[PDB]
């Protein structure tokens, strides 16, 4: 029955194990889903990610703020951004970014390494497809990777509104222990595998409703090993089925309340509202972004 879902989320019991890290060996490796005629993998993938995010308690405020890292294709366009803009309520401010130049439907685009990106405002949703293919070295140990993951951890901690959510792409080799640990600072988390790309070890690590404090202690080395164990023992049948029913695609406009609060007034009552997807905590000022430019000869 999974084949009619947009994808498969990591079952809670696998999250609770203490597996050792093993090589990822997917039974359905090299299989491919048959995409609708003329549909790109990256459109299908973001469509299924958004269909799954429709089932979670995302905070959706008026004047929602979404930032999308790793948004450029090798063709110079932004398919994922186009899906996010289709999905998000009209009027949502959408900023995207990538190392290489691309043309985009986002309200603003920053070109450069994500470590050069700074924003004054906080964000309601952070999406990342950043991925470095150099990490796919099956011949050396699979250790926690830093690079852009280090930036992403700090960007979540400093610039994600309480109540906000993230979806960060990982793979067998592209992962970071602190990011998994950060998942314990949300009311709920999972690793989500799209049905169209289920032959790959990629997943999106989704933190749902940020709490700004550790709700649970997660060892990220153990959790990634648990994630691989799940993938290794649970073949996911490749499927495009959910792409053919878009009648309920748009994210529900929930009118979620936005409040400015200071660390001393986040009580258990507020935390429970955050946990339920009913509250965003941040300022409501102008969205201002910038890219640092290194000047040399």
């Amino acid at each position: 029955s999974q084949a009619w879902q947009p994808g498969v989320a990591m079952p809670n019991l696998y999250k609770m194990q203490r597996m050792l890290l093993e090589k990822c060996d997917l039974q359905n490796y090299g299989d491919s889903a048959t995409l609708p005629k003329g549909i790109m993998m990256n459109v299908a993938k973001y469509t299924q990610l958004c269909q799954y995010l429709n089932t979670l308690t995302l905070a959706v405020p008026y004047n929602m703020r979404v930032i999308h890292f790793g948004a450029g294709s090798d063709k110079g366009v932004a398919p994922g951004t186009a899906v996010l803009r289709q999905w998000l309520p009209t009027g949502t401010l959408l900023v995207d970014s990538d190392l290489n130049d691309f043309v985009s439907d986002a309200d603003s685009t920053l070109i450069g390494d994500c470590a050069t990106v700074h924003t004054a405002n906080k964000w309601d949703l952070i999406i990342s497809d950043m991925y470095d293919p150099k990490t796919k070295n099956v011949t050396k140990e699979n250790d926690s990777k830093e690079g852009f993951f280090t930036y992403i951890c700090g960007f979540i901690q400093q610039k994600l509104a309480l109540g906000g959510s993230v979806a960060i792409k990982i793979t067998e080799h592209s992962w970071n222990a602190d990011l998994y640990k950060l998942m314990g600072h949300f009311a709920w988390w999972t690793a989500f595998v799209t049905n169209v790309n289920a032959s790959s070890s990629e997943a999106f690590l989704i933190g749902c409703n940020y709490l700004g404090k550790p709700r649970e202690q997660i060892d990220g080395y153990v959790m990634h090993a648990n994630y691989i164990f799940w993938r290794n023992t649970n073949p996911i049948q490749l499927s495009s089925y959910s792409l053919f029913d878009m009648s309920k695609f748009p994210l529900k406009l929930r009118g979620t309340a936005v409040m400015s609060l200071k660390e001393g007034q986040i009580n258990d009552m507020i935390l429970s509202l955050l946990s339920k997807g009913r509250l965003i905590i941040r300022e409501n000022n102008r969205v201002v972004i910038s890219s640092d430019v290194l000047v040399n000869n």
């Binding site: 549909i39 790109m40 110079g76 366009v77 932004a78 803009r85 289709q86 043309v103 439907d105 009648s247």
Partner: protein, 116 residues
């Protein structure tokens, strides 16, 4: 000086010369039960149309050149463009050669029925 690169004319002439259209326009998944209007804030393809991310179908966006108007504004990027399915092999050429009726929002000759 009066010099200005004419990319629209160059692309049309390259098309007439038998050149392969610009590819990797971003086609969206949608119901195909939409209004069929030409340029919309969300995908609106009807049964005879495909919906594409606007920026990916704009010649000026895709070629990294200025948009031909004083303010250099682009009326495709950030929107979705409906392209007739029979013309969806060349969305950039289609948007370049066709015009939007300002009353009905449909393409002239591809959905506009105002002149009847």
């Amino acid at each position: 000086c009066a010099f200005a690169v004419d990319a629209a004319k160059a692309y049309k002439d390259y098309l007439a010369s038998g050149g392969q259209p610009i590819t990797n326009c971003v086609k969206m998944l949608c119901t195909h039960t939409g209004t069929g209007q030409a340029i919309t804030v969300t995908p609106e393809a009807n049964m005879d149309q495909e919906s594409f991310g606007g920026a990916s179908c704009c010649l000026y966006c895709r070629c990294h050149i200025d948009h031909p108007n004083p303010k250099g504004f682009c009326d495709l990027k950030g929107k979705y463009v409906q392209i007739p399915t029979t013309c969806a092999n060349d969305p950039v050429g289609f948007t370049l050669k066709n015009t939007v009726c300002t009353v009905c929002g449909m393409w002239k000759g591809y959905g506009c029925s105002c002149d009847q």
